Amino acid sequence: TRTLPPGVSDERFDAALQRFRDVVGDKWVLSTADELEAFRDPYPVGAAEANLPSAVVSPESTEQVQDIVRIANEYGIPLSPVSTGKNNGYGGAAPRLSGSVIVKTGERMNRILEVNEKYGYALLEPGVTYFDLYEYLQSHDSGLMLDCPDLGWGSVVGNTLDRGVGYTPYGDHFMWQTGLEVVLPQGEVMRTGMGALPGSDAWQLFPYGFGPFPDGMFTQSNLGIVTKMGIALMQRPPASQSFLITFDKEEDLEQIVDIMLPLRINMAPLQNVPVLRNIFMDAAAVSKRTEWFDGDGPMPAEAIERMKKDLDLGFWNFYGTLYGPPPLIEMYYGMIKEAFGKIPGARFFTHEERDDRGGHVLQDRHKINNGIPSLDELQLLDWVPNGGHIGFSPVSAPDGREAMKQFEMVRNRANEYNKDYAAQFIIGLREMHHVCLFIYDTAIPEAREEILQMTKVLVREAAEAGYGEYRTHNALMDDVMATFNWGDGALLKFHEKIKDALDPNGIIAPGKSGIWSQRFRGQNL
Amino acid sequence: TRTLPPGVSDERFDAALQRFRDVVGDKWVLSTADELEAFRDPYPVGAAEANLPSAVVSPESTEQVQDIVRIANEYGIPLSPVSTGKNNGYGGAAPRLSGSVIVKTGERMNRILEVNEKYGYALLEPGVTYFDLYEYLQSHDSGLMLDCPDLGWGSVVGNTLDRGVGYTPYGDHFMWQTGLEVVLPQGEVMRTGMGALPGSDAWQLFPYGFGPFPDGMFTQSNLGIVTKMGIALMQRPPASQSFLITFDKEEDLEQIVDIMLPLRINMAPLQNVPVLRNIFMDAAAVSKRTEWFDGDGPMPAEAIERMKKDLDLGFWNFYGTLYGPPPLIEMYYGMIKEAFGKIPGARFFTHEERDDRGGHVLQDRHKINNGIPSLDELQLLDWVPNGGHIGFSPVSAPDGREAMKQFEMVRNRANEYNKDYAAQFIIGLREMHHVCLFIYDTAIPEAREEILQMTKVLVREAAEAGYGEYRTHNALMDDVMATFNWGDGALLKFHEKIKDALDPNGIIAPGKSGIWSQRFRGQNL
Ligand SMILES: *Cc1cc2c(cc1C)nc1c(=O)[nH]c(=O)nc-1n2C[C@H](O)[C@H](O)[C@H](O)COP(=O)(O)OP(=O)(O)OC[C@H]1O[C@@H](n2cnc3c(N)ncnc32)[C@H](O)[C@@H]1O
Ligand SMILES: *Cc1cc2c(cc1C)nc1c(=O)[nH]c(=O)nc-1n2C[C@H](O)[C@H](O)[C@H](O)COP(=O)(O)OP(=O)(O)OC[C@H]1O[C@@H](n2cnc3c(N)ncnc32)[C@H](O)[C@@H]1O
Ligand SMILES: COc1cc(/C=C/C=O)ccc1O
Ligand SMILES: COc1cc(/C=C/C=O)ccc1O
């Protein structure tokens, strides 16, 4: 049965499709069940089908984006913009509201508009992937490096717009975003910062421009369709060295985090964004669950021990990268060893010292931390059949007690619902993104359902403990936004007021981050 | 006669004043011409009077701020919030719209709410000055340092809200701002980021929270009255060293900037925010204009040579600070000498080597760059009698040709309008704030008008060359915003739409950054 935009009839929809085809060309509007299967969430959550798109439109220019938007306003059709649509763990390309049209900006708006060697930046269309950018930089023998997330097939823009992260010193992607072009919800185009000044060369040089600074408002947001974005690029250092610290016990988490803080808060000796990964995360990247335990339930303790012993890893594995001339790297590594070697059982390895299977994550982090994109982490999804993940991503103080509490709260529900808890703490200067990846068999309805129910429980329980998520799945956006309800929902109300003013017809990605325009509020969508 | 809010009668204003007194106390509402003289622009611009407050209200708490806002909605009274109201150069405490009531939040909301040593942050009310924070840090023997502007009497909050700058590695104040509380234009209170999650300890740890990130929209803005703000604070390094490089010729500017960029863009060896100051800036900091020249018109070349020789300074004077272990400092300083030494006539002094009158600026920079607040730069205002200044503050690429172009363009008009051009380039990673400070005799109506006309021409002319200002004076806000008119004034249209949705009655600082609510649009005040 045909997915349609809410309250839009089969023929009003057919009319709009034709209008879209006039803008973008026939090839670039998809609308059949078979074409649309590929734009469903690849890692579905919940037993019931959700997040169904009614069509995909692929514009080639900003002007085409403005025309699609205007058409959409005329018909009341919701539009859900994506760049490359690889937001897996959080919905993939699928819209929050069933029946919305995906605007897949990145299919043809994929140009590298500028890479400036002198000032260290790029101006990009949404379709540029980390692999694309890396190839450009290699080809031109650039002195610049990118900063990539774990999987390079996403979009430099797309990822920044969801405030995604990577692992070099430029790991906070939104922090390095400088300038954007956006189509607002009625079709007007606007440039932020110095791009609002006609003829300025400083769009990618000074982010703020003049007056109220809005670029943040277009991240985790449904206020427009972004068409161009700048990002600062770091200079490649002359030398780098990555390392692994293995820690034997579950219980070491607290001491690892407490030792780490003072070595990280000033960006030295911990220069890059360290990651702290549990054995579940690291074993799934190199092996199948059945290698260690056949059995539908929680993995017993001896099977955990064998994971550790066979891969020669700890329960907790700390990965970091140092940059600079070699004498600096040695001084900083020396400090890291001295500090973390206070933990009994800690062992250290550089990227030159492990060529075994357990060392494969280290080699992969060594690429990622040097801005070399990779797809090796896709192997996580082979942990179980028809493997999917969801990201439960609370923020934590860089405090060992708080990290242990979150770990324990999540582990306990993971056990109750029969899901493996793979953990990656992504360590900022003053906070950690505690990413909890739950790998599961996307073909079993009941696994899909337990995932949904488990993660709903974790959102509420984390909030009752004072913890919020940095980012979340379509399925949890309402639940997550409901937690940020200080002052009787003041934040949500503010966002709705802005949304309604910029988008009086309720066109752009309704429900993104729990923000619903007026015509959809109070409904069960 | 009495300054009254536009469209508001004596009788209604009297009623509104009494209601303000009900909220804050009789003593905390000022309304006589005598009491209000202190809230006039201390550096008035334009011959004609402008920017006249109708009153000043000083609330004690967020709750009183809410109550005030409610009252002003009911009566149609415009409110102009300040923290300490020391925005000298840009208007002081004076409101953009004459007749507005100033809400001086900092008079009584002046607590340090939290300084967290472990995570390196403060949570502040608006009345905390840089002096007050420095004192607290000193008294508690903190390992943290603050980052201050040139004058320490302003507000950590207020300064940040105008996207002000300082000179340590944390010199971009807005970058380090983390969390805020704001009273919206109809009286509702909101917290941003992790502060929107009840019980979170991460308000000052993770800036973004969940969903669209709004904090920027409260900077250079009239969308609410901020009542609390957090800021990250850097750890004090073990050692530091400041230096001065003097360069003999006006024309050295191009090469100085070109040599500088590769040393700045990686944050090393130029670790702090370097400043490049011209001789008029430096001479005004330690001497009066009549020591060098007492004729009519622009100072002649021979008199400029005398300033340089007597103070032992260059036409351009570069100040920087290095931080870290001593051998790191020496290695960086060596790199700096070697790079800038290419410029014929360059001379180098550290803060340990110069204690003379000309070295007074270096000593002041060595305090400021180590987070020790100062009022020594108030001496600039003694350059001429009744001295005041205005900041004309274009953004520059960190490119020598661009900086030279800006310099020549500004110099040409400075000479034409007989105003001395003191320049301070404030050097970020990828951009410079080129602060053109014109010091003038505020008593003379011709001088004030010439300042006004000159700056209007500079705004226009800079924009014709593709240059825009980062911040500006009350008197230039409409002109500066009119320059950011890409896409047919798209940016301003966006702002007005938000302004009208949040502030339906047009209450908060109408005209800030050229953003006027609907009721004032087109009235020419
Ligand atoms: C499964 C998984 C996921 C993952 C990861 C490891 C694994 C095994 N590691 C990640 C990491 O290290 N860091 C990180 O930030 N994310 C990581 N993920 C999650 C995900 O794969 C990536 O973040 C991915 O890069 C995101 O996908 P993409 O880059 O393709 O972005 P998108 O889906 O197009 O868009 C994301 C959302 O942003 C808004 N958006 C995007 N484009 C626009 C435009 N043009 N206009 C308006 N809004 C836009 C939409 O909300 C969209 O849903
Ligand atoms: C004359 C001068 C000025 C100067 C300077 C040197 C001289 C000789 N050096 C500066 C520097 O190195 N860096 C810098 O950023 N500014 C410099 N200036 C200019 C000025 O002195 C300082 O910026 C000063 O710190 C600013 O004044 P203050 O800190 O008192 O800020 P304010 O007047 O209260 O507020 C400024 C504007 O911000 C908005 N505002 C402020 N508080 C609020 C609240 N609570 N809510 C909403 N908006 C707020 C208003 O727009 C206000 O006008
Ligand atoms: C799904 O969401 C995320 C995954 C990862 C990385 C996981 C390990 O490869 C990081 C940040 C995220 O938000
Ligand atoms: C008036 O505005 C400014 C002054 C200064 C510094 C002046 C030199 O003492 C820096 C930044 C500004 O925006």
Numbering used by the authors:
A (entry chain B), B (entry chain A): 2 to 526
Sentences from the study reporting this entry:
Among them, one gene codes for a eugenol oxidase (EUGO) that displays significant sequence identity with VAO (≈40 %) and a similar but not fully overlapping pattern of substrate preferences. The overall structure of EUGO is highly similar to that of VAO, as indicated by a 1.1 Å rmsd for 490 Cα atom pairs (45 % sequence identity). As predicted, EUGO also shares with VAO the presence of a characteristic covalent bond between His390 (equivalent to His422 of VAO) and the C8M atom of the flavin ring.
Incubation of eugenol (1) with the enzyme in Tris⋅HCl buffer (pH 8.0) containing 1 % (v/v) DMSO afforded coniferyl alcohol (2) with complete conversion after 4 h at room temperature. The structural bases of substrate and inhibitor binding by the cavity were explored by solving the crystal structures of EUGO in complexes with isoeugenol (inhibitor), coniferyl alcohol (2, reaction product and inhibitor), and vanillin (4, reaction product); these were obtained by crystal soaking, resulting in highly defined electron density maps. In this orientation, the ligand 4‐hydroxy group is H‐bonded to Tyr91 and Tyr471 and is also in close contact with Arg472 (3.5 Å). These three residues are involved in the stabilization of the phenolate form of the substrate and are strictly conserved in VAO. Collectively, these features are fully consistent with the substrate being bound in the phenolic form and oxidized through a reaction mechanism involving a hydride transfer from the Cα to the flavin N5, coupled to the stabilization of a p‐quinone methide intermediate as demonstrated for VAO.
